Amino acid sequence: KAIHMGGWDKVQDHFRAEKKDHALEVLHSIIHGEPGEMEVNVEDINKIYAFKRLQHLACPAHQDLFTIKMDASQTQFLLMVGDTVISQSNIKDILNISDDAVIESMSREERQLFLQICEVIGSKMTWHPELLQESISTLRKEVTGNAQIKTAVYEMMRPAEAPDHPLVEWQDSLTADEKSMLACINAGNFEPTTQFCKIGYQEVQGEVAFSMMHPCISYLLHSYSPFSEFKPTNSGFLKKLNQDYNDYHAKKMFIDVILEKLYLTHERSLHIGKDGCSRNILLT
Amino acid sequence: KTYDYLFKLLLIGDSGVGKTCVLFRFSEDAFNSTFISTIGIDFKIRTIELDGKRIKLQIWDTAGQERFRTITTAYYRGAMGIMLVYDITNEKSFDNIRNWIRNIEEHASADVEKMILGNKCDVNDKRQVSKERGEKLALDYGIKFMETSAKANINVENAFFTLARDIKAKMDKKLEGN
Ligand SMILES: Nc1nc2c(ncn2[C@@H]2O[C@H](COP(=O)(O)OP(=O)(O)O)[C@@H](O)[C@H]2O)c(=O)[nH]1
Ligand SMILES: [Mg+2]
Numbered sequence: 326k327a328i329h330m331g332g333w334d335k336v337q338d339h340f341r342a343e344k345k346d347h348a349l350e351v352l353h354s355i356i357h358g359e360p361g362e363m364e365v366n367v368e369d370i371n372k373i374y375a376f377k378r379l380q381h382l383a384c385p386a387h388q389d390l391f392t393i394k395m396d397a398s399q400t401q402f403l404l405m406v407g408d409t410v411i412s413q414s415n416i417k418d419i420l421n422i423s424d425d426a427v428i429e430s431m432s433r434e435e436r437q438l439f440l441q442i443c444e445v446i447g448s449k450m451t452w453h454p455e456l457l458q459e460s461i462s463t464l465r466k467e468v469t470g471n472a473q474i475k476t477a478v479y480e481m482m483r484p485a486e487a488p489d490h491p492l493v494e495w496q497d498s499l500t501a502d503e504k505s506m507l508a509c510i511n512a513g514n515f516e517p518t519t520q521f522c523k524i525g526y527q528e529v530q531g532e533v534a535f536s537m538m539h540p541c542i543s544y545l546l547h548s549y550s551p552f553s554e555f556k557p558t559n560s561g562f563l564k565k566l567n568q569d570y571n572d573y574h575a576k577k578m579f580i581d582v583i584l585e586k587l588y589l590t591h592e593r594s595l596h597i598g599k600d601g602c603s604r605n606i607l608l609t
Numbered sequence: 610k611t612y613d614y615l616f617k618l619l620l621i622g623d624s625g626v627g628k629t630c631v632l633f634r635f636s637e638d639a640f641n642s643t644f645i646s647t648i649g650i651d652f653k654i655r656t657i658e659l660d661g662k663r664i665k666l667q668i669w670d671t672a673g674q675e676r677f678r679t680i681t682t683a684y685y686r687g688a689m690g691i692m693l694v695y696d697i698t699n700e701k702s703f704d705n706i707r708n709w710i711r712n713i714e715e716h717a718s719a720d721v722e723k724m725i726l727g728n729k730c731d732v733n734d735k736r737q738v739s740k741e742r743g744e745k746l747a748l749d750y751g752i753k754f755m756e757t758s759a760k761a762n763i764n765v766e767n768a769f770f771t772l773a774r775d776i777k778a779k780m781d782k783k784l785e786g787n
Binding site for chain 2: 399429430431432433435529530532534536574577578579581582585586
């Protein structure tokens with residue numbers, strides 16, 4: 326919550342309290358050692374958190390007119406105040422991926438979550454550039470650790486599972502054929518403690534239905550990199566996530582059978598661990 | 610084995626034509642009385658038996674929630690079968706079927722099985738769409754059609770069994786190599 330960029334610790338003293346938010350905005354405009362540092366590609370993703378900063382200064386009556394709509398191509402987010410498009414952003418530039426990378430379509434719920442995750446990423450990179458300069462991991466643990474993001478991700482994927490849900494110990498009930506069938510959801514491998522980090526489940530009237538996290542959501546939370554250099558590696562992670570995604574849905578009539586048996590034998594959860602360790606959480 | 614395969618199905622149609630009643634008739638053999646209003650009943654299941662294999666039909670009822678041809682590829686992802694429903698009480702809902710169909714061919718997989726249901730066969734006093742008009746639109750697109758009534762429990766069971774049998778058929782031939 327403490328902002329140190331641009332020496333703001335000692336510069337805020339020259340501003341009345343009523344005006345330090347305006348001044349912080351101009352300060353960000355001013356400040357955002359070339360030899361040795363990596364270029365970034367964050368213009369399009371920062372637009373989204375910047376839109377909410379614009380909406381926040383509107384009156385509560387008019388704030389409902391600030392919406393972000395996907396265009397007909399399903400390749401850009403349109404930033405709209407009423408009927409006016411004030412700016413657009415390419416989704417491939419938001420994700421910092423190559424142009425021939427494939428963006429699987431999202432449900433409207435997933436698009437909302439996508440933009441919320443972008444909003445947190447943008448705010449952390451805008452008001453706290455020190456996270457990224459330390460590490461890409463320090464930036465990422467600040468967004469996956471964010472309370473609203475964790476809550477919203479679990480609400481969508483595992484609504485009846487608390488984010489702090491305790492590990493359930495692994496019980497190997499599967500045949501070899503079943504393990505091969507499940508290998509497609511974790512990049513061609515079967516590892517009990519990681520197989521299910523992308524699998525969600527919800528019960529309607531006591532009946533469980535399974536689903537897989539959208540690849541762009543998976544990518545944004547765990548694999549996103551703002552550096553222009555990482556654009557090929559970013560696209561490599563996304564393509565692998567898409568492959569697991571399309572494999573699951575093609576074989577869903579077989580896989581959900583196996584998932585249900587594991588779900589029922591592990592106390593209605595796939596948060597499965599072995600000897601006290603698990604990576605089957607959605608995000609931490 | 611508890612069950613062998615999971616067939617995800619979608620109930621598609623305008624609001625008011627009886628999608629939720631059709632679903633609760635097929636899954637729980639129920640109509641009205643002890644009312645349970647779908648505050649979040651996104652799907653119901655019914656496990657049937659075909660050729661010695663037990664199929665869990667997972668039938669979704671989320672059309673019209675926010676889906677007024679706002680739909681894209683994501684809504685049909687994973688679906689193996691689609692039940693299109695109109696109301697023979699309501700010609701407006703029958704003409705809208707042409708829209709739902711083109712939304713499906715342009716956004717859903719090509720090997721998704723589809724069937725048309727003209728629900729409320731039991732209300733002949735208020736009928737607005739002939740049965741022959743129902744079979745003509747279905748003959749146009751080459752998909753099967755039947756008239757149904759969730760209230761009288763007419764043709765609900767054999768409609769879903771036909772759709773599931775069609776899904777199992779092309780799934781089974783796909784598993785001969787591929
Ligand atoms: N007479 C008769 N009424 C029906 C039938 N199916 C539904 N209804 C009634 O039409 C109204 C809307 O039904 P509903 O299932 O909620 O439509 P939905 O919006 O497509 O889910 C309800 O009052 C039903 O009881 C039917 O087959 N015959
Ligand atoms: Mg309904």
